[PDB]
Design a protein around this nucleic acid. Structure first.
Ligand SMILES: COc1cc([C@@H]2c3cc4c(cc3[C@@H](O[C@@H]3O[C@@H]5CO[C@@H](C)O[C@H]5[C@H](O)[C@H]3O)[C@H]3COC(=O)[C@H]23)OCO4)cc(OC)c1O
Ligand SMILES: COc1cc([C@@H]2c3cc4c(cc3[C@@H](O[C@@H]3O[C@@H]5CO[C@@H](C)O[C@H]5[C@H](O)[C@H]3O)[C@H]3COC(=O)[C@H]23)OCO4)cc(OC)c1O
Ligand SMILES: [Mg+2]
Ligand SMILES: [Mg+2]
Lengths: 730, 730
DNA sequence: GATCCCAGCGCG
DNA sequence: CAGAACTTGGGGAGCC
DNA sequence: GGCTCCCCAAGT
DNA sequence: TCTGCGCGCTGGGATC
């Protein structure tokens, strides 16, 4: 009572509170759908309460959070739950305003995660409820297929695709993908709320195995157990996909009672796998799927001018089949466009606007709807357009979307860092200098040894020295202008100016009860992206600090550990790495292989186009001398005699025929302007034919090692000037 | 103290509170710029407080609002203001935590409106403060022009354009339009906060004339005085624009002290005029400028599939120079796409999604970002694409944007109504039936008399009877199924089902202290868009209701008054109308004139294209017979002899030359595929040439009255089937 | 020695 | 993702 | 007989 | 227009 979002039932806390089944719904769309279904089901015994998204993990959080969490307190009040109270008897159950709890949400993985979090919360706080079938879920269809009047509902993508791949005609039906609850109309809620048999599963507790499964899924202690469990699941899925064995979808016709064991080990695990795919990047290009979609859309659009972040995000959502949320796209844009100190070393997207500074580490950026960006010319250098003809593209809803992974010239993952936070894994890879990497890979090309490389950050004046394997020390710049004055001119990585100031200066300037005052005053001269602290203190205290160490006193040093080199290899698998050299070698091997493939593809395409140009030259020369006559000629006879004259059909188009497989057409010669009959056009066409004839041999006489050199040479050719322009303005 | 958004000065309520100048800035962007300038100006004497948008009009509101208004209470606490306290002495001034108040906002009209509202507040509550120069404004430049190193700042559009039209080369400078405060970077705030002399004006009180001006601007009593004041200003502006006399911008070099009189009568009046343009629609097409921009962008895009509302709104903002706000575009889309009962009779944009129902009158619509729409085929019928060649298009920032006003076949304003709330005027025009209007205009075309017409609403089962000039009665449908049971099957216009139910049934079902219970029970059977109330009551009470009148008792009748027919005529002037017939006659006259113009334009274009086709036929016929030879021929000599042979250059392009004014080119007779030398293409070209030769005469033998007939015939031809499809599904 | 809290990012 | 004030004028219903 | 409050829409 | 919680893992700094 008194909670604004309470669409409670009539019998709330009444005589029949054991029959009042509150519906838990994440989202206002789900709340509206429940309200629409209330007309069918009535408001006497059903109450509606929305959720805020994802809930706190009580087993993983502190008691202070539990007390201070609004949503847990609200649900406890509404159900009538009591702290530490045991509910293993019906007399205590009568104290609750509601009898049963029903959960319903999207059919995607995040909904399963929400069910899992609710299960964990209930089991941790009041496990005995599970013994009485306290929880049920309202499933909703995810796919609807239409044929005339017949409508088929599919609750699982696997069974839906099984049905789809067993139809005489896919076009005989229209398929609608219900990837949410806002898509469903209020009218469909009538059908949803008219069928409890098809839309109600009950969480039937089995035994201690369910408790063990929940603990495995949610106890922070069993992280490594989660790692091995996910690895076993991944291996099983790999075996299934390499053997073609279909899996057993849980949403069966007779499926009405579900154990927590199957829910945890069958669908929440699918969410864990999806989260791992979302978060942990790929070794091949260092792009999480969201970033890959962003870049694929930016390439397809090929925008030549400024575009608003929201507009580009909407374009990404529409032409790349992104189905998670637009604000995530806005965050991805603002992350990939950041270029200040400690952020991305290479800014693929130009930050035309307030994208954040060292003051807050990108948390002070302007709103993402008044900031523009455009493709920096560097990115196209990293991913040559010609290379795209080899990438294995994907299909979502029978639409052409992003490839599995892009292919750059330089290993992108070890350039701009990687901060991925999966489930059962993680990834924290620092930055490196681009020129050092390109020199190392050029040396590797020549057969020399790869020089060991140390992490570096763009325009980072501080020095980093390795103190051990995957163990480095980051240190700022401290100077002593005069005997009782010091200057800070550099800060460690991930040490924002505002946070460092507020956490260091005044906590130590005036001090606390535990630590007295140290310094007297400080003056800051902060430029756009540089820190200049001038601190004056008592002479003796600065002498003590020098005795104690200037870096040690001011906390201008920090430890960086990189014991979590976990990436996705070329063949789509999770792999933990040890040092940079292994990743560099793997990238080198794959890049050589794709140079082999692209040389073959380029030589084939160039041969086909040279053949086409030679045919065009032959035909125009025949026309000039009058050997060919088409004036007032029938199309069929003309085509027949051209075939008999020794002309081949569409070599360029015929070239694409060999690509996809693994009457005759002469439009290309015939779709030519009459200007071609002028001598200047003839000379120009002959010139182009000869140029292509030279160029095909020039390329076929090269080697894959040769072509990489100009890739790096061109990449570095204008890398300096833009970086010079990055400093010439400043 | 304790207000979260307070960046107060150090001396807040201290010894020198008379020197603490709080800054009032609407927008978090303006707050951020103020914070950036705080570094230059120091936080000792300056405090920062942001606005919430637009503030309450204290002179026009009740005391309950004043007590319950968060903005006013917060600002009163921050300044230390006291109710009913007089501040006409320095001793009372020292009770205030702040000495001066500075106002800073955008340079557009809304900023002037915010200054006006603040002035009204201060004058109404504590006028004596104005006698002591209590208020000052911080102006910011609106246009920045760049040339190499020189930068010029312009604070007023008039002076900026005066400078612009007096330059040897506009491209010698780059112009940036600072149409906001988020555009300005923090670095520019340094320059802004370094120059008070150029960015500080003080509100110097003059006398009772200032008080009279404020009262005129803000007192609800002087609405008519505002009407005549605005009319006089409009007449003066018309005289100036017809005589070319420039106006005197107050943003002068020596301008440092400003009187409230000038502020009211030279800028805030401009905001009133702009609001009038925004709100009061146009006579010709009933589109406010926002709706016109939406339709212009929708036509240019010519989207053939569903598009998200947010995506289309962003497209509007970028390709139509809209510079107000995206949420306004979302509201405009959701308004123009609405099609339920009582809403738009004609839905130009198909509402593909939950756009709202009769339950809440469009206030229950889904999220503006989860809903799609696309151009209904009907709209293109109203605005034929060929007609667009006559509209006078506009230019913003030297970019091609929407025209002044579109020409439809039917008068659009009297079709979907008009609900505009301007300043000093208003407009409320109800709906009408399309078929009735088209029949009336067809009769007007034949010289007959225009039948008087009554307002009608699409699918509105209720009946409307006129009770006087601009005075109508709207009545629902109530029946008596049995002697003690009634059924309501229709509600008056603008009477939403939920609002009517909550305001009628339960205030009368159970009654109040003043009125006891009347009915016993009610059951509703509400379909998608129909109301079905079945009410059972005591027999004697229903007998009394029949004695008192069934419509009267249930409030199923309402009065509609249309004494505010105020529109914008073709010449862009405000005009108050009396009845529908005058508007119809004006639209009829302008539409006949534009048919005359379009007939002339079409005959000219058709003649030019027929000439071009005849030239192409002559050339190809010459080529077939060999009279013309171009094989291996020089371009220059070929062009010369073609000129001498009697061929003219680009008649279609030459046709456009005459349009814009109020060497020879032969690509069109040369840019054809070699298929043109085949006999089939020759026969086809002859067929088109002859068809155009027939068609030009067929059109030139018609009359403007004729061409309208098929416009209406085609419009009605498929008007029924879509309306039939609107009901066939239901 | 040991526990606790927080900052990094694509998501609900 | 969602929910939150005000403007500006006409006119209609509902209280005293 | 009269004052008061609210709904309508493109904007802060 | 803005502003508000939680996730999931690693590891580092502070506090006891
Ligand atoms: C908090 O920060 C600022 C707020 C504002 C106001 C504002 C102010 C409000 C308020 C709401 C609004 C809101 O308008 C609302 O938008 C909604 C957008 O979605 C649709 C569904 O419905 C719209 C509402 O019909 C409209 O009323 C803002 C949108 O555009 C604005 O200009 C509005 O309710 C409380 O007071 C201005 C600023 O600087 C100029 C700010 O910095
Ligand atoms: C109110 O209605 C609902 C809210 C939500 C949550 C949510 C919940 C919150 C909360 C915040 C949020 C918020 O996340 C924030 O997004 C921001 C988007 O712009 C940028 C600038 O910054 C992002 C924040 O980094 C992130 O924290 C929502 C955005 O997308 C969501 O899914 C979020 O703070 C309090 O609790 C889910 C629902 O159903 C699934 C709802 O019905
Ligand atoms: Mg979902
Ligand atoms: Mg503005």
């Amino acid at each position: 009572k008194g909670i604004p979002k309470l669409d409670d039932a009539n019998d709330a806390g009444g005589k029949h509170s054991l029959e009042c089944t509150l519906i838990l719904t994440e989202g206002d769309s789900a709340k509206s759908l429940a309200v629409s279904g209330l007309g069918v089901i009535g408001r006497d015994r059903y109450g509606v309460f929305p959720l805020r998204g994802k809930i706190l993990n009580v087993r993983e959080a502190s008691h202070k959070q539990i007390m201070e969490n609004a949503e847990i307190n609200n649900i406890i009040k509404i159900v009538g739950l009591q702290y530490k109270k045991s509910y293993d008897d019906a007399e205590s159950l009568k104290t609750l305003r509601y009898g049963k709890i029903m959960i319903m949400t999207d059919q995607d993985q995040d909904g399963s995660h929400i069910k899992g979090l609710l299960i964990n919360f209930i089991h941790h706080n009041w496990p005995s409820l599970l013994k009485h079938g306290f929880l049920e879920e309202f499933i909703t269809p995810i796919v609807k297929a239409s044929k005339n009047k017949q409508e088929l509902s599919f609750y699982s993508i696997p069974e839906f695709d099984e049905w789809k791949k067993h139809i005489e005609n896919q076009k005989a039906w229209k398929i609608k993908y219900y990837k949410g609850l806002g898509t469903s109309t209020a009218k469909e809620a009538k059908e949803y709320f008219a069928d409890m048999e098809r839309h109600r599963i009950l969480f039937r507790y089995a035994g201690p195995e369910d408790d063990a499964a929940i603990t495995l899924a949610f106890s922070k202690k069993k992280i490594d157990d989660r790692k091995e469990w996910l690895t076993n699941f991944m291996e099983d899925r790999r075996q299934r996909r390499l053997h073609g064995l279909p899996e057993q979808f849980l949403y069966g016709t007779a499926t009405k009672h579900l154990t927590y064991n199957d829910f945890i080990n069958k669908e929440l695990i699918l969410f864990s796998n999806s989260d791992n795919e979302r978060s942990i990047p790929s070794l091949v290009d260092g792009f999480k799927p969201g970033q890959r979609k962003v870049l694929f859309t930016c390439f397809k659009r090929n925008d030549k001018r400024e575009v608003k972040v929201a507009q580009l995000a909407g374009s990404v959502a529409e032409m790349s089949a992104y189905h998670h949320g637009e604000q995530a796209l806005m965050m991805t844009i603002v992350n990939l466009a950041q270029n200040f100190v400690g952020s991305n070393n290479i800014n693929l997207l130009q930050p035309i606007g307030q994208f954040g500074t060292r003051l807050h580490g990108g948390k002070d950026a302007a709103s993402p709807r008044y900031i523009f960006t455009m493709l920096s010319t560097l990115a196209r250098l990293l991913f040559p357009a010609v290379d795209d003809n080899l990438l294995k593209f994907l299909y979502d809803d029978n639409q052409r979307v992003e490839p599995e992974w892009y292919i750059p010239i330089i290993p992108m993952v070890l350039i701009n860092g990687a901060e991925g936070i999966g489930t059962g894994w993680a990834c924290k890879l620092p930055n490196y200098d681009a020129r050092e990497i390109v020199n190392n890979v050029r040396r590797m090309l020549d057969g020399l040894d790869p020089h060991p490389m140390l992490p570096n950050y763009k325009n980072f004046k501080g020095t980093i020295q390795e103190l051990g394997q995957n163990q480095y020390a980051v240190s700022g710049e401290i100077f002593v202008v005069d005997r009782n004055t010091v200057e800070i001119t550099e800060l460690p990585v991930r040490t924002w100016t505002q946070v460092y100031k507020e956490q260091v200066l005044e906590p130590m300037l005036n001090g606390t009860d535990k630590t007295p005052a140290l310094i007297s005053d400080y003056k800051e001269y902060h430029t756009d992206t540089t820190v200049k602290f001038v601190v004056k203190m008592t002479e003796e205290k600065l002498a003590q600090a020098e005795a104690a160490g200037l870096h040690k006193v001011f906390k201008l040093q920090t430890t960086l550990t990189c014991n979590s080199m976990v990436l996705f290899d070329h063949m789509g698998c999770l792999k933990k790495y040890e040092t940079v050299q292994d990743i560099l070698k793997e990238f080198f091997d794959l890049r050589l292989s794709y140079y082999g493939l692209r040389k073959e593809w380029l030589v084939g395409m160039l041969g086909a186009e040279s053949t086409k140009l030679n045919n065009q030259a032959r035909f125009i020369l025949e026309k000039i001398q009058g050997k060919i006559t088409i004036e007032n000629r029938s199309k069929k006879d003309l085509i027949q005699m051209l075939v008999q004259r020794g002309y081949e059909s569409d070599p360029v188009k015929a070239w694409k025929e060999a690509q996809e497989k693994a009457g005759p057409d002469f439009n290309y010669i015939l779709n030519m302007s009459l200007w071609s009959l002028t001598k200047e056009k003839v000379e120009e066409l002959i010139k182009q034919r000869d140029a292509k004839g030279r160029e095909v041999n020039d390329l076929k006489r090269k080697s894959p090692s040769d072509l990489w050199k100009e890739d790096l040479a061109a990449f570095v050719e204008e890398l300096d000037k833009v970086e010079s322009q990055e400093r010439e303005d400043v």
